[PDB]
Amino acid sequence: RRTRFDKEKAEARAHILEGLLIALDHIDEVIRIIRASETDAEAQAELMSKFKLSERQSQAILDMRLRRLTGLERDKIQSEYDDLLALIADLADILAKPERVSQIIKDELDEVKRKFSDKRRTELMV
Amino acid sequence: RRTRFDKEKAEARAHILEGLLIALDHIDEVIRIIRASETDAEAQAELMSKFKLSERQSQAILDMRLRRLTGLERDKIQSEYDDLLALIADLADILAKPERVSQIIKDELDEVKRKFSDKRRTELMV
Amino acid sequence: KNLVNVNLTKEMKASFIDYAMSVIVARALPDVRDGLKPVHRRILYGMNELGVTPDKPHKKSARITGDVMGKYHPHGDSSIYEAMVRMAQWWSYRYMLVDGHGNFGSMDGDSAAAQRYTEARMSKIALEMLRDINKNTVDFVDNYDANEREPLVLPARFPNLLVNGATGIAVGMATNIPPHNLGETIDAVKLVMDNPEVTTKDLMEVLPGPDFPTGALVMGKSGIHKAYE
Amino acid sequence: GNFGSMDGDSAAAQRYTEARMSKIALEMLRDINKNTVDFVDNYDANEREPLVLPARFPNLLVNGATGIAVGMATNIPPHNLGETIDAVKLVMDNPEVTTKDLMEVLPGPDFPTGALVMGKSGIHKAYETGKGSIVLRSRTEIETTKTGRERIVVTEFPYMVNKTKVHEHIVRLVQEKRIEGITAVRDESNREGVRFVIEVKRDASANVILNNLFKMTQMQTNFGFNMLAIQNGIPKILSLRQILDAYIEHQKEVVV
């Protein structure tokens, strides 16, 4: 459940970042529709119609900062996007193999054992 | 001094809004330079070189929100810009004519007279 | 006869001018452009920077005077509170700039105990005196601690000399209280600002004269005419 | 007995606590009764007092002169005793030592509680002309926790600055709400050890908070130098060279 939650969170962030990445793909068409827009709902509807986008993606595009329209910023977005897809692939590998599940359990249990484990105050006599 | 201060404040805001208005004039060249930029300092320097801009103007352009790239937003910016230039013309008319200075003094003094003025507890006898 | 320091001609002149001007400014007669003593000016500006306006209830005056001591005016605590008490009484002072909270005095002659017993705040007139201050209106100066900034003269919105008067300590030169009715004063300001040559008889047509905080009878319009001439 | 604190405290009266001379007053009074400085008759015409105490170390540079202006006030340049004595030696050896070469000797303000001194230009101005100002930045350091909420360790408030007024001013500036980021202030001593932690929250570079508390509070202040004192019966603004030339002349008088 924790792995599926973090996959949900990273997958939603990668979804938003993919929408901004598609905005970085064809910037000129997005600007052309924004200049042809009249309301924000019209702008997001025409962007979702033209580039097959979501409401989250279109809100992220219409709230994207213009300073982020540079290759110095496209590099950071693309690198972070590949890193989050790598994290999604890692969590899918965790959800696919029960061996690594037991491995995570062993690791955190041994962390607890390092942090707290004393020994027997009681002696087993015979 | 108060009129010159408010003219300074509205003039700085109209300067920033004029920089954003020039950004709204040629949006495509600004986007073309942002896509050709590598750092933010490069982007603001090339914008100030290409459209004769200020540091305040170039920071406002590179921090301008993409949702503000619509005719529903250009209308609000243009109307508010004309209103602030009207306020600048009003304050310049206040700074140009000492009659209106005395008029503002009369108005605020009569406001104080309405808000507080009692009459003489002392009688002038003879 | 301990110090025997001799060569003190221009240094005794400079030190004597310095101590005399410090008397005249700080503990003596106030300004034209706002009619307020420098103790009073630091009272109003410190209570402005604390924001103790009549939207909030009254605050303890000891904290206000302690902030005065820590920011603007390093002198007697009871003297600053004496200015607090005299300003915040309807009979001691015509239009109470500070509105107080507690026992201050009586017309019989009474005093409050200290600055930590009773409360105060600004009244509706100090907000007038401090309306449009933070807008390059009067130039600030750095005070004795070089981190705080104080106003030179408070930007007045009504001429407070004629309203409240100036009590004076003579080191040769003392000064008196002509109080005035606010509305006739403002009308006099209007007529002076309209016609640059109004005769003082025509302003005695406007201004009767001494509007006392408790009322009286004034005998002598000749001395009134002599005074405003 | 109880005299005070750095927080600002006073003794009750002269009949509650005791005192005596320390090891330095015996230095200041060693060889006094031997025609060393001329006495005068005081106000009761039976007692005799000394005009000037025969010093054995120049106490102006050590302890400074706080001044009341009736036009003319004066300041405290404190100094380290050993470097001061070495400066006296080098001045008495070479009658023309440049003041840069004595700033080689003398660092400057040796405070009784320690601080940080910013500005060697104002120091050079002070020991050349007499008038000047230096900047006093407290011994503060930024210590980043592994958790993330950073730390400002302040240990040396400047010369004649309260602790309690500065910490109350910091808490007030938190509640005056001009700038934020300060979590809390820990005053973790009663009387012993001067090391105090003020916390900066997570996601806030504490050098920004440090520069802003230096801008606002009494933690980095200005401090003026105006070395004004009595020479030959008149008050004069005197330089570091002139103080030590006069002190060497006085010790020549004492020795002769």
Author numbering:
A (entry chain B), B (entry chain A): 361 to 486
C (entry chain A): 4 to 232
D (entry chain L): 105 to 360
Reported in the publication:
DNA gyrases are type IIA topoisomerases found in bacteria, archaea, and some eukaryotes (plants [Evans-Roberts et al., 2016] and plasmodial parasites [Dar et al., 2007]) and are capable of relaxing positive supercoils and introducing negative supercoils into DNA as well as performing other topological manipulations. The GyrA dimer forms two gates that facilitate DNA passage. Here we present two different oligomeric structures of Streptococcus pneumoniae GyrA-ΔCTD forming an open dimer complex with a 44 bp unbroken DNA oligonucleotide.
The Tetrahedral complex, built from six GyrA-ΔCTD open dimers, was formed by mixing GyrA-ΔCTD, GyrB, and the oligonucleotide in the presence of ciprofloxacin and novobiocin. A negative stain 3D reconstruction of the complex formed in the presence of GyrB indicated that this complex is comprised of six open GyrA-ΔCTD dimers assembled with tetrahedral symmetry, but surprisingly no GyrB was present. Collecting tilted and untilted particles (673,694 particles), imposing tetrahedral symmetry, and masking out the central density improved the resolution to 4.0 Å. A reconstruction with imposed T symmetry, with a mask for the protein, and excluding the DNA density at the center yielded an excellent map to 4.0 Å resolution according to the 0.143 FSC criterion. In the assembly, GyrA dimers are situated at the two-fold axes of the complex and make contacts at the C-gate domains, whereas the interactions between neighboring dimers at the three-fold axes involve contacts between the N-terminal tails as well as interactions between the N-terminal tails and adjacent tower and WHD domains. In addition WHD and tower domains interact with each other. For example, detailed comparison of the Tetrahedral dimer with the closed dimer shows that the largest conformational change takes place at the N-terminal tail region and the exit C-gate, leaving the winged helix (WHD domain), tower, and coiled coil domains moderately rearranged. The Tetrahedral complex provides a higher resolution structure of the open GyrA dimer whereas the Dihedral complex provides the structures of two anticipated intermediates in the reaction cycle. Although GyrB is not incorporated into the Tetrahedral complex, it must be present in the reaction for complex formation and therefore has a role in complex assembly.
